[PDB]
RNA sequence: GGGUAGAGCACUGAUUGGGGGUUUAGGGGGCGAAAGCCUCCGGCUCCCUGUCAAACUCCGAACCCACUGCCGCCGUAGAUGGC
RNA sequence: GUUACUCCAAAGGGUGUCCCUGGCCUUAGACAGCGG
RNA sequence: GGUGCCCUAAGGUCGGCUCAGGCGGGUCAGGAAUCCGCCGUAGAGUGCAAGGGCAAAAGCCGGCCUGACUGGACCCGUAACA
RNA sequence: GGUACGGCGGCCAUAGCGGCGGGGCCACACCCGGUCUCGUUUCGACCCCGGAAGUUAAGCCCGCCAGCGUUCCCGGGUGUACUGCCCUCCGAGAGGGGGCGGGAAACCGGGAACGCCGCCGGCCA
């Protein structure tokens, strides 16, 4: 809770979290085999080029020609993340929920809306500095439960960052 | 670790320090190894030979024994090791870089270049080194416009003077 | 079908594996527990085999019906936990009769392989129905291919057949 | 039906491992050396497919009579016949 | 060096019943204002109970095989071996 | 029965006789008679 | 129970990475699949049957190549011993 | 002689997995930037380059926990199951018995175990 994250900040700010990253996707996915300028939408929105991601075993909604441009994905770091959050959070409803969250402190939004048709998905995930020793190559090793995140620190971080919750 | 049919890997592989495939390939040669290691702040070099009870080292040297972390320091420590390897009566060795990726233009191969120049026969290519403007120091001195290469020169000639 | 002196011996190898046996049949027997299945009774009347046998499912089902009818008519469902412990796994085969050219039997049925002094079936009861449990024992014994014998078991794992028989 | 002998016939167990070895062997075995006259046990490591003798002769003890490349020359006796094999040191083990 | 007998369920696959939790992959209806908030025959994950394997193995004999040294036997009255 | 083997019939029953055991009775028990 | 083939890559080598499934998060009728995190000894995958083998790989993603060559030698198996 | 420091190894779980508590000259990490070396089918996240304001929180070092998994020991199970050689022993047969030799698996109870060894270095005094 508040006392918790503030007293372990007092302990040290290395225990205070940062923001890991923010990833946008066209989740449902309706490109097909044409040049959807939903990729062009995000170009102007964010300021750097997206990337496709190809389908898998054959389906009906979209993604039958396995190995086919079907959707769009973008991943953002640093200050761009804060800024686009200030944009989209503000855009969308008051009173962020509590069940926005996975049980590590990461949340997701399912928002929607010449060309302007789009139903999008955003996902934000969090971190604290020493999450590197699990993704690094040399002397790799996994994170104990202390240096891991729970639901509280996530929601409190969301509040302090920008929001009020359920 | 969850019962039988679970294979626990070697100590140094669960640690994350040794690559046993590459180790085999290097040991198939019956020649000493010039081992090179890199931290954020120092560089280490050794010359190692094989024993089944445990590898036996013959030589060592260190950037702190220089201070008494960068490409210049790499070259200088290469010079060190190349000049001590002839002291003991061996002019041959093959490069060991463990789990360091082989990018061209790195302090690893700077150590290699130094060891070659200092009179040690290590088989090599000439197109893997870092070029001399990154070696001598023009690179950080060009960055400082937003190690003095004379100092580089002087401690270099100090080493060659010492080991004449 | 054929007599059981053909199939009671245990000298052939085990022949159980369904993913390699083609044309294998299904079990005629489907129920294996009966009565009150939680009542925490006192006495366990169990049958044991004298020597090793192969018991057919036809016989197993005959025993099932006979014994359960006796017990339902003279004890009542709320007592008499009845159980058959052994499932029929071994596949019986017969030679489709040419003559002895290409003799390797086609499947015809199933049996359970029971070893010396191995429990076949059990009836859990209370003090005042032992005689009916023993009647079930005798009815069952009469319908098997080789001989069997019964024991009476207490909680804690003890054999009490001597004295419990004496007092009656 | 009559079936000829081949390299991998009835090798299910003999070229299998216990699942707690499961991988690359340690390197001492790869780097063993031998002298002429030394007795050696023929013990096949099933993860290394070079220098592999016919598994028929797995479990026998022969003598070294030389080297050719990285392989050693091992003689065995089969009945009255003497037979000669070129075996990688990983498939070998010294007596005593 | 080896996986047979025996044994067992740790893999592959078979197999009884109970005590619970998620309920639903799914046709049945019920208060079904209708696939509904909610349940009924059923699927998923446990724990206790009971059964199996010629083409299963966490285990594992007696026994057999090669080799070294010794005891014993054969051999200069010529063996083993070769033509 | 007078059969080592080559070359000998069961499930199920009898306490027919000889034996080893375990419980309930026994200064009056299991009946056998006169009576309630 | 399978074969009487297929591949200029499914062949050679170098580098980097790690799989199936389950759970918790979101748009979706079964949803095939695309997004995020955790667990996870290989349950996956391997040109093809079955068995064996393989995890900083023998699997996935890429880069450069043609040792799928010329001249020769001694060994093992088919066909134990012979 | 000392150091709560590091590199290359061997045996490959009695060493693992997990949990708890403690530490920072030297050192080892995390940390800030990315112009340049190298690169991201998008992100300097990971790989690479440059350096330390700053942190003991993680990794690392140090000590503990018998919770899971693993190996060993004593005793029971039990000389049980199985088995090599001989038998004018039994049994209608199957299948068992006797003598001389070998000898388990599950399970049960009680103990040890939260790594051992080699080579060269660094820093303080």
Swiss-Prot record, chain A:
The keyword Ribonucleoprotein applies. The keyword Flavoprotein does not apply. One of its GO terms (biological process) is translation. Keywords: Ribonucleoprotein, Ribosomal protein, RNA-binding, rRNA-binding, tRNA-binding. It comes from the Archaea. InterPro entries: Ribosomal_uL5, Ribosomal_uL5_arc, Ribosomal_uL5_C, Ribosomal_uL5_dom_sf, Ribosomal_uL5_N. Pfam families: Ribosomal_L5, Ribosomal_L5_C. GO terms for cellular component: cytosolic large ribosomal subunit. GO terms for molecular function: RNA binding; rRNA binding; structural constituent of ribosome; tRNA binding. This is one of the proteins that bind and probably mediate the attachment of the 5S RNA into the large ribosomal subunit, where it forms part of the central protuberance. In the 70S ribosome it contacts protein S13 of the 30S subunit (bridge B1b), connecting the 2 subunits; this bridge is implicated in subunit movement. May contact the P site tRNA; the 5S rRNA and some of its associated proteins might help stabilize positioning of ribosome-bound tRNAs. Part of the 50S ribosomal subunit; contacts the 5S rRNA and probably tRNA. Forms a bridge to the 30S subunit in the 70S ribosome. Belongs to the universal ribosomal protein uL5 family. NCBIfam families: PRK04219.1 (NF003258). This is Large ribosomal subunit protein uL5. It comes from Thermococcus kodakarensis (strain ATCC BAA-918 / JCM 12380 / KOD1). The gene is rpl5.
Swiss-Prot record, chain B:
SUPFAM superfamilies: Translational machinery components (SSF53137). The keyword Calcium does not apply. Keywords: Ribonucleoprotein, Ribosomal protein, RNA-binding, rRNA-binding. InterPro entries: Rbsml_uL18_euk. Pfam families: Ribosomal_L5e. Disulfide bonds: none annotated. GO terms for molecular function: 5S rRNA binding; structural constituent of ribosome. One of its GO terms (cellular component) is cytosolic large ribosomal subunit. One of its GO terms (biological process) is translation. It comes from the Archaea. This is one of the proteins that bind and probably mediate the attachment of the 5S RNA into the large ribosomal subunit, where it forms part of the central protuberance. HAMAP family: Ribosomal_uL18_A. Belongs to the universal ribosomal protein uL18 family. PANTHER family: LARGE RIBOSOMAL SUBUNIT PROTEIN UL18 (PTHR23410:SF12), RIBOSOMAL PROTEIN L5-RELATED (PTHR23410). Part of the 50S ribosomal subunit. Contacts the 5S and 23S rRNAs. This is Large ribosomal subunit protein uL18. The gene is rpl18.
UniProtKB/Swiss-Prot annotation, chain C:
The keyword Ribosomal protein applies. Signal peptide: none annotated. GO terms for cellular component: cytosolic large ribosomal subunit. InterPro entries: Ribosomal_uL16 (IPR047873), Ribosomal_uL16_arc (IPR022981), Ribosomal_uL16_CS_euk_arc (IPR018255), Ribosomal_uL16_dom (IPR016180), Ribosomal_uL16_euk_arch (IPR001197), Ribosomal_uL16_sf (IPR036920). GO terms for molecular function: structural constituent of ribosome. PANTHER family: 60S RIBOSOMAL PROTEIN L10. Part of the 50S ribosomal subunit. This is Large ribosomal subunit protein uL16. The lineage of its organism: Archaea, Methanobacteriati, Methanobacteriota, Thermococci, Thermococcales.
UniProtKB/Swiss-Prot annotation, chain D:
GO terms for molecular function: structural constituent of ribosome. Transmembrane segments: none annotated. One of its GO terms (biological process) is translation. GO terms for cellular component: cytosolic large ribosomal subunit. Residues 1-26 are annotated as: Disordered. Keywords: Ribonucleoprotein, Ribosomal protein. Residues 1-23 have a biased composition (Basic residues). InterPro entries: Ribosomal_eL21, Ribosomal_eL21_arc, Ribosomal_eL21_CS, Ribosomal_eL21_sf, Translation_prot_SH3-like_sf. Pfam families: Ribosomal_L21e (PF01157). NCBIfam families: PRK04306.1. Part of the 50S ribosomal subunit. Belongs to the eukaryotic ribosomal protein eL21 family. This is Large ribosomal subunit protein eL21.
């Amino acid at each position: 809770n508040r006392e918790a994250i503030l007293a372990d900040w007092e302990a040290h700010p290395m225990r205070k979290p940062r923001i890991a990253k923010v990833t946008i996707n066209i989740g449902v996915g309706e490109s097909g085999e044409r040049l959807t300028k939903a990729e062009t939408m995000l170009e102007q929105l964010v300021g750097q080029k997206p990337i496709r991601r190809r389908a898998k075993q054959t389906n009906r909604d979209f993604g039958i020609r396995r190995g086919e441009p079907i959707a769009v994905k973008v991943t953002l770091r640093g200050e761009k993340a804060y800024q686009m959050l200030d944009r989209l959070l503000e855009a969308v409803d008051r009173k962020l929920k509590a069940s926005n969250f996975d049980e590590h402190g990461n949340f997701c939004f399912g928002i929607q809306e010449e060309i302007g048709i789009f139903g999008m998905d955003v996902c934000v995930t969090l971190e604290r500095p020493g999450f590197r020793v699990a993704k690094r190559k040399r002397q790799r090793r996994k994170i104990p439960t202390k240096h891991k995140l729970t639901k509280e620190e996530g929601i409190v971080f969301a509040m302090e960052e920008l929001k009020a919750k359920v | 670790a969850h019962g039988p049919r679970y294979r626990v890997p070697f100590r140094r592989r669960r640690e994350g320090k040794t690559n046993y495939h590459k180790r085999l390939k290097l040991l198939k040669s019956k020649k000493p190894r010039l081992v090179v290691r890199k931290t954020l702040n120092h560089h280490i070099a050794q010359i190692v030979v094989y024993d089944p009870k445990g590898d036996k080292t013959l030589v060592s040297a260190h950037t702190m024994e220089l201070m008494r972390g960068n490409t210049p320091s790499a070259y200088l420590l290469g010079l060190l090791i190349g000049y001590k390897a002839k002291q003991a009566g061996i002019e041959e060795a093959i490069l060991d870089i463990g789990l360091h990726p082989p990018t061209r233009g790195s302090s690893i191969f700077a150590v290699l270049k130094g060891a070659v120049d200092a009179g040690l026969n290590v088989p090599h290519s000439e197109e893997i080194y870092p070029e001399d403007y990154r070696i001598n120091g023009e690179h950080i001195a060009n960055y400082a416009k937003a190690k003095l290469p004379e100092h580089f020169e002087e401690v270099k000639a100090k080493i060659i003077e010492k080991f004449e | 079908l054929r007599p059981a002196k053909i199939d009671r011996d245990v000298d052939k190898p085990a022949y159980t594996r369904r993913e390699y046996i083609r044309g294998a049949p299904g079990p005629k027997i489907t129920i294996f527990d009966m009565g009150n299945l939680s009542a925490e009774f006192e006495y366990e009347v169990s049958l044991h085999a004298e020597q090793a046998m192969q018991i057919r499912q036809n016989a197993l089902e005959a025993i099932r019906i006979q014994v359960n009818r006796y017990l339902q008519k003279n004890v009542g469902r709320s007592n008499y936990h009845f159980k058959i412990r052994v499932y029929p796994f071994q596949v019986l085969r017969e030679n489709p009769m040419n003559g002895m050219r290409r003799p390797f039997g086609k499947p015809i049925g199933l049996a359970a392989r029971v070893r010396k002094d191995q429990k076949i079936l059990t009836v859990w009861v209370n003090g005042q129905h032992l005689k009916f449990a023993l009647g079930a024992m005798h009815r069952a014994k009469m319908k098997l291919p080789y001989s069997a014998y019964y024991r009476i078991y207490d909680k804690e794992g003890n054999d009490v057949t001597t004295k419990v028989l004496s007092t009656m | 039906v009559k079936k000829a002998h081949s390299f991998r016939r009835k090798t299910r167990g003999k070229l299998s491992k216990h699942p707690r070895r499961r991988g690359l062997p340690p390197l001492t075995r790869f780097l063993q050396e031998f002298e002429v006259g030394q007795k050696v046990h023929i013990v096949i490591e099933p993860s290394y497919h070079k220098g592999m003798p016919d598994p028929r002769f797995h479990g026998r003890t022969g003598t070294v009579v030389g080297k050719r490349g990285d392989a050693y020359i091992v003689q065995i006796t089969d009945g009255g016949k003497v037979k000669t094999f070129f075996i990688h040191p990983v498939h070998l083990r010294p007596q005593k």
